[PDB]
């Protein structure tokens, strides 16, 4: 939801990582802000993007993951 | 401020996809010329072409000014309404006042005194208070509708539900200090009110 509109969270998140002039930095607020698509696309359910094990299987990964590339 | 204020309300009832622009109430009023803005001692012709208040709605272009931003504490139009939801999930009493606002300005204090002490709070003493502008001068005015206040967080506190009987105690002050006569004026009523979930009965049965 944003304020803005532009102003959302996924937003936010990454606006913050791509802030940080340090490398290490960047990667912990990228690397968390790329677990909320897996958790929210996945949800309760078993074999979706939610876990761990099963995340590579679904298709969407790769779309994620390029993004987030 | 207060203009501002009226016009963010204007805003969010957009949001809200009412008629921005339409008052469905007070019809005969809103035609009504307002004076003296009607006469010539008013020089303003913008103005007296305004004096309908239908027309007033729209204060942009009628006007020709603007608000930097239309927000209340720094809420997003969007997030007030949001804000407003939110408000609306626990269930309210409230307190009706009748206002046959006559006279001088007065202040009002009233609190809801609950017939027990013992392990309950004795009268809270302040279930808000509000205040009306007046003057000798004043034309005599009566409000159509209730003016509501909202006593549910003092009622809570004080750990009486809407059921509890208590009685509220209204203390009228004019600026001057002066106590008025609070006989004359109508007891305040105490409205419950409830979202569209409302409770089932113990006693009978609804359903059949």
């Not at chain 1, 790329?34 to 099963?54: D, F, K, Q, R």
């Not at chain 2, 007046?134 to 009622?155: C, H, N, P, W």
């Amino acid at each position: 939801d944003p304020e803005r509109g532009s102003e959302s969270f996924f937003y936010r998140q990454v606006l913050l990582a791509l802030e940080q002039t340090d490398f290490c930095q960047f990667e912990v607020q990228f690397e968390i802000t790329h677990n909320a698509i897996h958790s929210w696309t996945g949800g309760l359910t078993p074999y979706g993007m939610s876990t761990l094990e099963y995340t590579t299987y679904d298709p969407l990964f790769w779309l994620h993951h390029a993004n987030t590339d | 401020t207060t203009d501002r204020i009226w016009a963010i309300w204007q805003d969010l009832q957009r949001f809200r996809k009412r008629p921005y622009r339409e008052a469905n109430c007070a019809i005969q009023l809103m035609h009504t010329p307002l004076q003296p803005f009607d006469k010539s001692d008013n020089n303003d012709e913008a103005t007296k072409t305004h004096a309908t208040p239908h027309d007033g709605f729209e204060y942009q272009n009628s006007f020709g000014y603007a608000y930097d931003n239309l927000e209340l504490n720094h809420y997003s139009i969007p997030q007030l309404d949001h804000m407003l939801q939110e408000r609306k999930r626990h269930d309210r009493v409230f307190a009706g006042f009748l206002l046959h606002n006559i006279g001088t300005s007065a202040d009002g204090h009233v609190f809801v005194c609950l017939p027990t002490g013992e392990h309950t709070k004795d009268c809270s003493h302040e279930a808000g208070m509000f205040s009306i502008l007046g003057g000798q001068t004043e034309m005599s005015f009566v409000f159509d509708r209730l003016y509501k206040l909202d006593i549910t967080k003092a009622l809570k506190k004080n750990g009486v539900h809407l059921q509890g009987d208590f009685d509220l105690e209204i203390e009228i002050t004019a600026v001057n200090g002066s106590h008025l006569d609070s006989h004359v004026i109508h007891s305040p009523t105490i409205l419950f009110e409830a979202g569209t979930d409302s409770a089932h009965t113990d006693d009978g049965h609804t359903e059949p």
